[PDB]
RNA sequence: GGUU
């Protein structure tokens, strides 16, 4: 009655290979719950994706499901803003379809709370069916049934969908676990960990058995296999409270007017061996996940913060890259090899910046830092000349304290020139590792590419920029976009450039890890970095891609054996998980950031919090999305509530109200 | 996108 009956695998599976139906995985809009699409590559079709707009078109399918779709007649296709499909695609149309069936899966339980509307609509005896609101907004509300609504009101629950009948406007399901109270820090972190499928259990006894037992020390056997650099002034430069030091650097005068620079990375592969429980776990996690109030390390704590970590005044192993630069800052020598180092100081970015800028400081570390700063400044200019994108992101530091429920302060992270110096040096080391490894193993090198933006990606944003400042963004090359981004300036508002440099990050494709045999040498290109070949080598403590590159670099030099990296399915499955786990760890981090911003705003509960500048960043049929740079929060405001819908990129004054829900507004323009 |  409300939906068309689904088809049986009898005609579903035949139709897909027949071509009468197309098959793909459902991707639902993070903004709109009832708007999806299937991306893929079908036979006899020029298009890369089919839209599934509406509840009737999505036919009860959930995000992630493997749906079978039937194309709507080309007359019903969605344009840019009886015919042939090719005629329609030439006039910029997008294919449209209706979900005709689903492929059974282990569809995850969803974290969330009972929909507050249902709690307000009620004021209990017996069993009652009520609506559950999954935290994931791509998932519709599920109807659950409990005889203890009272004991569940304030709880975070996990719900599994059981079915969605042809006549029900919502699917039915049931709760499988009570995770805790809504608002609880540990429950809200468990929600984030579960929603992003983060493995976060303690390491097994098998994993801890892989660590070195007893008092750890550098051995004479290993020293006779390493370049001993312990007499060199090596330092590390990291954020505050960083116990995991992945890289350290040195710099000195050599051969008259030349400079030697080493980038010394933690020798994780000395402790982490292939085929062990520890490596099996590190491979699965693939990356360390960082939350506001906690972190889920890829490797055990003993390695992370002690034996691998380049700790100051402790002898440590390392896998170093070294270069000799001439007067023109051109490399005259390059060395990859295993070393034994001893960091003189584990510095914080600001301390390094003060040291460089203090005229009274003539210490070996201060001088080395000035040299690395000089050299890095040169690398940044060559990179802007190359066409590298210089984009912006906002990260907040949350001031927590055991005596307060909510964080007492929220400020942006501090940035110094030493932050750019470390970035340049790591970008330099990773690119040297990429080239060196690829010279040895052209058919299975773990690399990192970034495709150029999709077609018409900057259209919407360009309509607004050209309207406001008379400029357009040119994505033909990395260099053109970088030069046109430099011209994106509003003379009456200095934030405009940083805002555009932030919104342009949302128009780019995700960068991906890959085996060098998947594509041609020209497809190795990193659009964002304007580089022909790139990889991650500098963080094996917190990234498994780096572990694989350190392995391949040792086999490239012949100081280790080659592994079966070699098996095609295996090297392409390795990249696949690196990409999945990387994405989930990014969502987990952003989720935790939003969480703590909500907790900070709880300090002004039922109180009046002052109004800050905001910008119109998105415009749907129904809502105006406003970004408040001060808090890094995006508000959703209904067009029905406004005297006039503001234009895209308009700088408005945003009213913020805490009623535990956050309400946004535009100071002027609200209907009374 | 990118660095720690
Ligand atoms: O994705 C990341 C990577 C690193 N860090 C921060 O960077 C610091 C530098 O250490 P590392 O984790 O990069 O080795 C860490 O202490 C941590 O605070 C993050 O917050 N997120
Ligand atoms: Mg580090
Ligand atoms: Mg690191």
SS3 per-residue string spanning A190-236: HHHHHHCCCCCCCCCHHHHCCCCCCCCCCCHHHHCCCEECCCCCCEE
Apex A539 CA angle, A591 and A290, nearest 5 = 20
Distance CA A214, CA A59 (A): 60
Q: Is A479 within 8 Å of A487 (Cβ atoms)?
A: no
Longest dimension (CA), chain A: 89
Distance, CA of A495 to C1' of B1, in Å? 20
Determined by X-ray
Task: Please report, for residues A72, A105, A271, the alpha-carbon distance to residue A101 in angstroms, rounded to integers and kept in the order given.
Answer: 15, 13, 49
Distance CA A310, CA A265 (A): 8
Protein residues bordering strand B (Cβ below 7 A)? A 237-239, 242, 245-247, 389-393, 419, 422-423, 426-427, 430, 448, 450, 505, 508-511, 526, 528-529, 534, 536, 538-539, 586
Residue nearest to atom 7 of ligand 1 (CA): A239
Distance CA A473, CA A487 (A): 9
Q: Strands, E, within A291-380: which ranges?
A: 295-296, 316-325, 331-341, 345-348
Where do we find the tokens 């203090």?
A: A358
Flag whether A242 is marked binding. yes
Closest ligand to A288 CA?
A: 1
Distance CA A536, CA A448 (A): 7
Which residue lies nearest B1, CA-to-C1' measured?
A528
SS (H, E, C) A532-567: CCCCCCCCCCCEHHHHHHHHHHHHHHCCCCCCCCCC
Where do we find the tokens 């400079």?
A: A259
In the 8-state DSSP scheme, what is residue A344?
Answer: S
CA torsion angle for A413, A416, A421, A424 (degrees, to 10)? Answer: 50
Nucleotide nearest to A450 (CA to C1'): B1
Distance CA A193, CA A589 (A): 10
**Which nucleotides in chain B lie less than 7 Å from some protein C-beta?**
1-4
Residues in a beta bridge with A648: none
Query: Nearest CA to A371 among A275, A251, A278?
Result: A251
* Percentages of chain A per state (helix, strand, coil), in multiples of 5: 30, 25, 40
Task: Please report, for residues A606, A636, A665, the alpha-carbon distance to residue A655 in angstroms, rounded to integers and kept in the order given.
Answer: 14, 12, 5
Q: How far does chain A reach from its first CA to its final CA, in angstroms? A: 41
Task: Please report, for residues A431, A577, A611, A647, A665, the alpha-carbon distance to residue A644 in angstroms, rounded to integers and kept in the order given.
Answer: 51, 47, 20, 9, 13
In the 8-state DSSP scheme, what is residue A609?
Answer: P
Query: Nearest CA to A269 among A564, A543, A579?
Result: A543
b/e A55-80 (16+ beta carbons within 10 angstroms → b): eebbbbbbbebebbbbbbebeebeee
Task: Please report, for residues A3, A33, A70, A99, A622, the alpha-carbon distance to residue A58 in angstroms, rounded to integers and kept in the order given.
Answer: 9, 10, 11, 5, 20
Angle between the N-to-C axes of helices A544-557 and A417-440, in degrees from 0 to 180, rounded to the nearest 10: 50
Q: For residue A603, which phi and psi values (nearest 5 degrees)?
A: -65, -30
Query: Nearest CA to A310 among A325, A324, A320, A300?
Result: A320
Task: Please report, for residues A40, A296, A652, A654, the alpha-carbon distance to residue A616 in angstroms, rounded to integers and kept in the order given.
Answer: 33, 36, 8, 10
Which residue lies nearest B4, CA-to-C1' measured?
A238
Give DSSP secondary structure letters for A70-136: EEPPGGG-B------HHHHHHTT-B-BEEEEEEE------EEEEE-HHHHHT----S-EEEEEEESS
Distance CA A637, CA A634 (A): 10
Q: Which residues contact A6 (CB under 8 A, 6 or more apart)?
A: A59, A60, A100, A101, A102
In the 8-state DSSP scheme, what is residue A21?
Answer: S
Q: Which two tokens stand for residue A403?
A: 């005596």
Q: Return the SS3 of A339.
A: strand
Give this entry's resolution in angstroms: 2.2
Distance CA A18, CA A62 (A): 25
Residue nearest to atom 3 of ligand 1 (CA): A290
Q: Which residues contact A186 (CB under 8 A, 6 or more apart)?
A: A180
From the centroid of its chain, how far is CA A212?
A: 33
Distance CA A444, CA A442 (A): 6
Distance of CA A304 from the midpoint of ligand 2 (Å) = 11
Q: Is A48 within 8 Å of A41 (Cβ atoms)?
A: yes
Query: Nearest CA to A116 among A94, A141, A96, A86?
Result: A141
Q: Is A613 within 8 Å of A318 (Cβ atoms)?
A: no
Total Cβ atoms within 10 A of residue A594: 15
Strands A247-254 and A258-266, sheet pairing? antiparallel
In the 8-state DSSP scheme, what is residue A642?
Answer: B
Q: Return the SS3 of A291.
A: coil
Q: For residue A74, which phi and psi values (nearest 5 degrees)?
A: -55, -20
Query: Nearest CA to A319 among A105, A477, A525, A547?
Result: A547
Distance CA A292, CA A594 (A): 10
Distance of CA A309 from the midpoint of ligand 3 (Å) = 9
Q: What is the CA radius of gyration of chain A?
A: 28
Q: How is the beta sheet containing A97-103 ordered, strand by strand?
A: A49-53, A35-39, A22-28, A66-71, A97-103
Residue nearest to atom 5 of ligand 1 (CA): A290
**Number of Cα atoms under 13 Å in the Cβ half of residue A262:** 29
Total Cβ atoms within 10 A of residue A180: 18
Distance CA A439, CA A448 (A): 15
Distance CA A392, CA A497 (A): 10
Query: Nearest CA to A78 among A53, A100, A46?
Result: A53
Task: Please report, for residues A31, A50, A238, A594, A655, the alpha-carbon distance to residue A635 in angstroms, rounded to integers and kept in the order given.
Answer: 12, 29, 33, 12, 10
Q: Which residues contact A415 (CB under 8 A, 6 or more apart)?
A: A349
Apex A287 CA angle, A211 and A547, nearest 5 = 60
Q: H or E segment at A290?
A: strand A289-290
Exposed, middle or buried: residue A347 (CB in 10 Å: 0-12, 13-18, 19+)? buried
Ligand 1 is surrounded, with C-beta below 6 A, by A 238-239, 242, 244, 246, 290, 539, 541-542
Residues in a beta bridge with A347: A237
Distance, CA of A529 to C1' of B2, in Å? 8
Where do we find the tokens 């390059």?
A: A334
Q: Which two tokens stand for residue A100?
A: 């005709």
In the 8-state DSSP scheme, what is residue A329?
Answer: S
Q: Is A238 within 8 Å of A245 (Cβ atoms)?
A: yes
Distance, CA of A540 to C1' of B1, in Å? 21
Distance CA A115, CA A141 (A): 8
Give DSSP secondary structure letters for A487-545: T--BTTBTTHHHHHHHHGGGGSPPPEEEETTSS-GGGG-BTTTTBSS----S-TTTBHH
Distance of CA A395 from the midpoint of ligand 3 (Å) = 17
Q: For residue A338, which phi and psi values (nearest 5 degrees)?
A: -80, 140
Distance of CA A266 from the midpoint of ligand 1 (Å) = 14
> Gaps after which residues in chain A, C–N over 2.5 Å?
81, 123, 564, 659
* A433: region left, alpha or beta (phi > 0 left; psi from -120 to 50 alpha): alpha
Task: Please report, for residues A565, A613, A617, the alpha-carbon distance to residue A652 in angstroms, rounded to integers and kept in the order given.
Answer: 53, 6, 11
Best of A238, A299, A311, A584 for a ligand 1 pocket test (most atoms within 8 Å of beta carbon)? A238
């Amino acid at each position: 009655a409300l939906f068309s009956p689904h088809l049986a695998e009898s005609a579903l599976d035949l139709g897909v290979q027949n071509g009468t139906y197309l098959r793909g995985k459902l991707r639902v809009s993070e903004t709109n719950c009832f708007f999806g699409e299937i991306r893929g590559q079908w036979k006899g079709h020029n298009f890369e994706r089919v839209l599934l707009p509406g509840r009737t078109n999505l036919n009860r399918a959930i995000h992630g499901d493997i749906v079978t779709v039937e194309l709507l007649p080309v007359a019903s296709w969605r344009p840019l803003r009886e015919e042939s499909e090719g005629a329609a695609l030439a006039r910029g149309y997008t294919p449209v379809g209706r979900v005709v069936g689903i492929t059974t899966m282990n569809r995850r339980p969803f974290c969330g709370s009972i929909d507050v509307e249902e709690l307000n609509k009620l004021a209990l005896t017996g069993t009652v069916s009520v609506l559950f609101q999954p935290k994931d907004n791509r998932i519709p509300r599920i109807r659950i049934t409990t005889a203890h609504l009272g004991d569940l009101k304030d709880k975070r629950l996990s719900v599994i969908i059981d079915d969605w009948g042809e006549h029900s406007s919502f699917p039915v399901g049931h709760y499988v676990e009570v995770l805790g109270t809504i608002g609880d820090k540990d429950t809200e972190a468990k929600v984030i960990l579960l929603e992003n499928d983060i493995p976060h259990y303690d390491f097994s006894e098998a994993v801890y058995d892989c660590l070195p037992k007893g008092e750890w020390n550098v051995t004479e056997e290993e020293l006779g296999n390493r370049l001993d650099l312990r007499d060199l002034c090596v330092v590390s430069v990291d954020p505050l409270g960083c116990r995991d030091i992945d890289d350290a650097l040195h710099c000195r005068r050599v051969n008259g007017n030349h400079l030697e620079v080493g980038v010394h990375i933690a020798d994780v592969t000395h402790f982490l061996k292939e085929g062990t429980a520890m490596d099996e776990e590190a491979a699965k996690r693939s990356t360390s996940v960082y939350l506001v109030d906690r972190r889920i390390n890829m490797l055990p704590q003993l390695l992370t913060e002690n034996l691998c970590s380049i700790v100051a005044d402790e002898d440590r192993y390392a896998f170093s890259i070294m270069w000799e630069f001439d007067e023109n800052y051109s490399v005259v020598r390059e060395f990859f090899g295993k070393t034994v180092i001893r960091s003189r100081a584990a510095l914080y970015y600001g301390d390094a910046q003060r040291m460089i800028d203090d005229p009274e400081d003539e210490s070996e570390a201060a001088v080395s830092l000035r040299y690395l700063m000089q050299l890095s400044r040169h690398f940044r200019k060559r990179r802007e000349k190359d066409g590298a994108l210089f984009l912006c992101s906002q990260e907040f530091k949350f001031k927590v304290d055991n005596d307060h429920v909510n964080p007492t302060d929220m400020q942006a992270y501090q940035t110094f020139d030493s932050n750019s110096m470390i970035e340049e040096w790591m970008l330099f080391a990773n690119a040297a590792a990429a080239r060196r490894v690829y010279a040895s193993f052209p058919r299975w090198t773990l690399l990192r590419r970034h495709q150029a933006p999709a077609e018409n990606a900057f259209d919407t944003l360009n309509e607004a920029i050209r309207r406001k400042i008379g400029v357009k963004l040119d994505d033909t090359t990395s260099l053109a976009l970088n030069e046109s981004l430099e011209k994106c300036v509003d003379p009456s508002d200095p934030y405009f450039n940083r805002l555009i440099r932030t919104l342009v990050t949302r128009c780019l494709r995700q960068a991906q890890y890959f085996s060098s045999s998947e594509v041609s040498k020209d497809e190795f290109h990193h659009f964002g970095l304007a580089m022909p070949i790139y990889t991650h080598f500098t963080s094996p403590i917190r990234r498994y891609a780096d572990v694989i590159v350190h392995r391949q670099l040792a086999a490239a030099l012949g100081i280790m054996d080659v592994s079966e990296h070699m098996v095609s399915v295996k090297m392409e499955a390795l990249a696949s998980n690196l990409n999945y786990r990387h994405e989930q760890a990014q969502k987990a981090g952003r989720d935790s950031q939003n969480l703590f911003t909500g907790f900070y705003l709880r300090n002004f509960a039922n109180q009046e919090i002052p109004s800050e500048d905001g910008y119109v960043v998105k415009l749907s049929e129904t809502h105006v999305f406003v970004l408040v740079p001060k808090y890094g929060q995006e508000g959703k405001i209904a067009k029905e509530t406004l005297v006039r819908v503001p234009n895209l990129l308009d700088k408005v004054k945003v009213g913020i109200e805490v009623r535990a829900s956050l309400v946004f507004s535009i100071i002027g323009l609200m209907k009374g």
